[PDB]
Amino acid sequence: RLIPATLYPGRVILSLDFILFCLRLMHIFTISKTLGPKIIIVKRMMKDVFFFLFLLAVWVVSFGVAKQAILIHNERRVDWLFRGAVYHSYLTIFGYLLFTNILLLNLLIAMFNYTFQQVQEHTDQIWKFQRHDLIEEYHGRPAAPPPFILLSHLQLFIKRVVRHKQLKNKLEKNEEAALLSWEIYLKENYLQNRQFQQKQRPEQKIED
Amino acid sequence: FHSKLQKVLVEDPERPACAPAAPRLQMHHVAQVLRELLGDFTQPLYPRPRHVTFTMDPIRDLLIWAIVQNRRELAGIIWAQSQDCIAAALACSKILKELSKEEEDTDSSEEMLALAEEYEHRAIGVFTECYRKDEERAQKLLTRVSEAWGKTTCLQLALEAKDMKFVSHGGIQAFLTKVWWGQLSVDNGLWRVTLCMLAFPLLLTGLISFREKRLQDVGTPAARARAFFTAPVVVFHLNILSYFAFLCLFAYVLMVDFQPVPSWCECAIYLWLFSLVCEEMRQLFYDPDECGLMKKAALYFSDFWNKLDVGAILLFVAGLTCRLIPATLYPGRVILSLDFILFCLRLMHIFTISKTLGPKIIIVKRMMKDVFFFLFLLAVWVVSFGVAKQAILIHNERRVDWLFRGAVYHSYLTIFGYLLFTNILLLNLLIAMFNYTFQQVQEHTDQIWKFQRHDLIEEYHGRPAAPPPFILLSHLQLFIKRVVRHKQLKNKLEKNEEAALLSWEIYLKENYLQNRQFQQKQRPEQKIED
Known part of the structure; x- marks a missing residue:
């Protein structure tokens, strides 16, 4: 920004900054009860991509290389062959069908479904555990919108x-005594019911 | 065993040399057939001849006599008081599995195959008892040559006996992961290892970790450099990077360096492709256990990944002449391009190390079969509708060359875009053929992959400590030693320590048997029977 002449090198920094901003925006679904745990599982899904990229892009680029190799054998154009190979790879990606839909797709789907299976029970517990930190944070947050929150940011200094x-x-202690007595009664009831119900197990009856 | 013992008794010729009229039974006769069953790697258990005289470990031989003829109840009673009870419990399973496949029966051939699976669990349950009392002393008995079982270890028996539930215990996997690194600590990660291998001046600082802190606190600069090349994971990383850089260089010469005078990388591709086969000399030549050369060749041929590695040179077979005469441009580009494709396919073997995708490649190698026929399910109708596309056009025309390009363009357009049959009818056929053999493999793939890990670990342990680009210094140095x-x-x-180790094993075996019987008497069916 300070020197705006570096157009060609400099657009990519701010564009990838936008991409990272959008990625950070994805955290909002933790509140969503139906997609909160879903983002939770996706954050563990992210690992397989790092290597499926090496499983996909390398062969896509390899066949793009063969595309230029078909063309002519010997040529010396570093700049021109770069654009040509980029166009060939883009065309192959847009369109190859033998390996994309058939061989790679089931690799992807399987790497997915292996770690999809057996997570139904635990994701609910994990997400319902993680809810409280955000709840307490936003309880402790100030009561003003971020655009205007400066009024409280300049007002939380005089108190300190x-x-x-x-x-x-x-x-209050008098009420707490009654609460504790109620708890004692319910604990006694629970223990009594628990032992009465556990003596009725078939294994316990056979042992008896 | 009786039949085969009779055969070896009658077939030995300088035994009847003294008296051919009467065949006399001796000790070496049972030992030879026992070695035949158990494996070549062991020396004969009973020495060749050349009052009361006990042999060492006078219980192992009675245990063999009880195991071989399938005597269930005698077998446990005799094994209850054995000297070493992991090696014996694994040899008893190896013998049973070997002798339970060529019996020509369905009753005892099924009984012994199940008794082997029980001595398997005996061996597993004795070892987890030792692995819970101590950590370091529970592996020194895992790798110790036993003088009472054929001069072999307790791990090579399980690996060669196809013991799928023992080599994937966790106490076996921790020991394998420990040698996968070497003398350095394991709680470092892979990202740090790549960061340090990429940057050569990144090991003298406080980045990489170490165990046996005597070398971590007082760090020797000379030893620190040597430790990484000693480690096999560094060798694997150097090999993978060298092979990938080679493949990129071959792509580079395929692109632009294709001169009639051999480009600076023609001799380079020859030599660095020889870099693959020169190590194959070591893998194929080496026989840690006495094995036949033709058996070595058969084992090499039985490996499909090795078949692909050989197919690299197999598609070289058409490439050297194409290079020698470079005029055959139009016919000749395809040979080298498909050679590149096969190189890339061979590159796919690298994920066996990846714990999360190793078994995944394992299952994909069995996924490969359905494609061979789904291609005939897909391409035939795609080409058929491409044919109808030209049939719509005009009815009668005579253009062999032109209609070829036209039909190719029509088929390419159809593939790029048909929707009624692709997304709806074919997709679920594909997904179903997938999911049918996807289902019910969750349990066994882990065991299979954890079994297959050891071969690669031992191979890279036996590999030289130099990168493939430079490994010639050791390839020219491993000749003077021979x-x-x-x-x-x-x-x-050392024997004095081994006696204490065996006594510790005896105590833990007694504890395990005692707990096992105490816990099995408590089954509800057993209580009802009582």
Whole structure:
């Protein structure tokens, strides 16, 4: 930005900054109950791509190389062959069918489904555990929109110059005694029911 | 065993030389057939002849006599008081599996194949008892040459006996991962290893990790440099990078360096393709156990990945003449291009190391079969509709050359774009042929891959410590040693220490048997029977 002459080298930095901004935008679905755990599993899906790229792009580029090799055998054009091979690879990607739809697709689908299987039980627990950190963070957040939040950012200084009661508070002792007695009664009921119901197991009956 | 023992008894000719009228049974006769069953790698258990005189370990021989003729209840009773009970428990399974495939029966051939799977579990359950009392002392008995079982280790028996549930225990996998690295620590990662191998001046700083902190705190600059080339993972990374750089160079000369005077990389492609086969001299030539040369050739031919590696030279077979006379441009580009394609296909073997995609390549190598016929399910109708495309055009025309290009263009357009049959009818055929053989492989692929890991680990342990580009210095240096097995996976311990190790094993075996019987008496069916 400071020196705007570096157009050709410099557009890519800001464009990839935009791409990373968009990637950071993807965190919003943790609130979504139906897609929160889904983003959770995708964050573990991300690993297989790093190597499926080496499984795909290398052979795509290889066949692009054979495309230029078909053309002519011997030529000396570093700049021209770059554009030609780029165009050939782009055409191959847009269109190859023997390897893309048949051989690679099931590799992809299988690498997916292997780690898709057996995650139904645990993702719910993981996401319902991770909810609380965001809930507490946004509880502790100021009550102003980010565009305007400066009014409180310039106002939270005088209080310091001269935990919340929602998730952690002190009760009155007289009421707490009744609460503890209620808890004692319910614990006694639970233990009594638990032992009464566990004595009825068929293995326990056979042992008896 | 009786029949084969009779055969070896009658076939030995200088045994009847003293008295041909009566055949006399001796000790070496059972030993020879026992070696035949158990494997070539072991020396004969009973020495050749050349009051009461016990042999060493007088229980192992009674255990063989009980195991061979399939005596279930005697077998456990005799094994309950054995000297070494991982090696014996694995040899008892190896013998049973070997002698349970050429019996010509369905009753005892099925009984012994199941008794082997039980001595398997005995060997597994004894070893996890040792692996939970200690960590370092639970592997020194994993790799120790046994003088009472044919001078072989407890790991080579399991590996060669097709023990699929023992070499994938976890206590076996930790020991294999430990030698996959060497003397350096394992809790480092792969990204750090690549960062250090890419940047040569990146090992003298506090980046890479180490175990046996005597060399980590007081770090010797000379030893630190040598440790990485000693490590086999570094050798593997150098090999993969060298092969990939070679393949890129071959692509480069395919692109632009294609001169009648041999381009600066023609001799280079010859020599660095020889770089693959010169190591093949080591893999094929080496026989750690006494094995036949024709058996070595058959084993090499049985490997489809090795078949692809050979097919690299097989498609060289049409390439050297095309290079020698470069006028055959139009016929000759395809040979080298398909050679590149086969090179890329051979490059796909690298993921066997990848824990998450190793078994995945394993299953894909069995996925490859369905494509051979789905091609006949797809391409034939694609070409058929391409034919109808030209049939729509005009009815009668005589242009062999022109209609070829026209039909090729029509088929290419149809492939690029048909939608009624591609996405709807064919897709689910494909997906189903996939998912049918996808289902029910979750349990076995892990065992198969964890079994196949050891061969690559041992190969790269036996590999030289130099990169393929430079490995010629050792290829020209491994000749003077010959002119005038390793201790990592097979070594001899000191007898005084071995006695204590065997006593520790005896104590843990007793504990395991005691717990096993105490826990099996508590089954509900057993309680009802009681």
